[PDB]
Amino acid sequence: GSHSMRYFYTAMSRPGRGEPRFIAVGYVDDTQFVRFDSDAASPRTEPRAPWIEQEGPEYWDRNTQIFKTNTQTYRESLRNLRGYYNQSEAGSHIIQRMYGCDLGPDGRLLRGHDQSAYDGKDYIALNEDLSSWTAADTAAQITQRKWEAARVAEQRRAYLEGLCVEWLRRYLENGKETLQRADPPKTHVTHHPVSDHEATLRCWALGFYPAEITLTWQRDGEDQTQDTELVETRPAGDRTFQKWAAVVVPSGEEQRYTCHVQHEGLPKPLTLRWEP
């Protein structure tokens, strides 16, 4: 299977309430394995998946040093970005960063990502060439010119093609029993009359990993996109995810509807009907 690793940074100012909070979490695919929070009583990098606990004390101190220094750097960055937009010192603002590498089914680098956002809009992104930037606006051009001056993309590139891929592979090996195990959805179809002439069919997928999944309703073999109610894929809390799709159908037409399920956990798609 293909795999990826991502770190997610959130730096949040809060004037009148101390210095900005810095939080970092690490993921391998849909599995978090590490966290750091500057707001912690004793801020340090903490395991969040059993397979990362075997990393030695020097691993944890290395992470912790990286994150503490980032905490300070993102506080300067928030200062700067407030200036770039001529904003007042009254408001709270947020920088977000998500970065990482993607591996193909061969363990080979597919590509890297390094994107940042300010108050929830794209701010600056590293292009897929890992060599040039995309600024969303004249404020982010300031950042771009400053990163070009200091050859920042070269640093990002060395990391994304090198250490990122190396540690991802090491994590995938160490947590192979789970990281490289796809658990198929457990499925079923429910039926609930809404009136004398209509009824709800709900298609359920439970206990799957990873989160990525396709759930669709067809009527006489045709896609029922606009007529399907479809909840966001949701975590169960045991590493697995859940989802459902629902359609209101004319009573007596139920067998004309099929639920289709695609997931890495099963060899061929499932086709399901309500079974009374």
Binding site: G26, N63, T69, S77, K146, Q155
Partner: peptide, 13 residues
């Protein structure tokens, strides 16, 4: 492993 800090100055935004 996150991106390490560089040789010199971690460049702010």
């Amino acid at each position: 492993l996150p991106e390490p800090l560089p040789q010199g100055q971690a460049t702010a935004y």
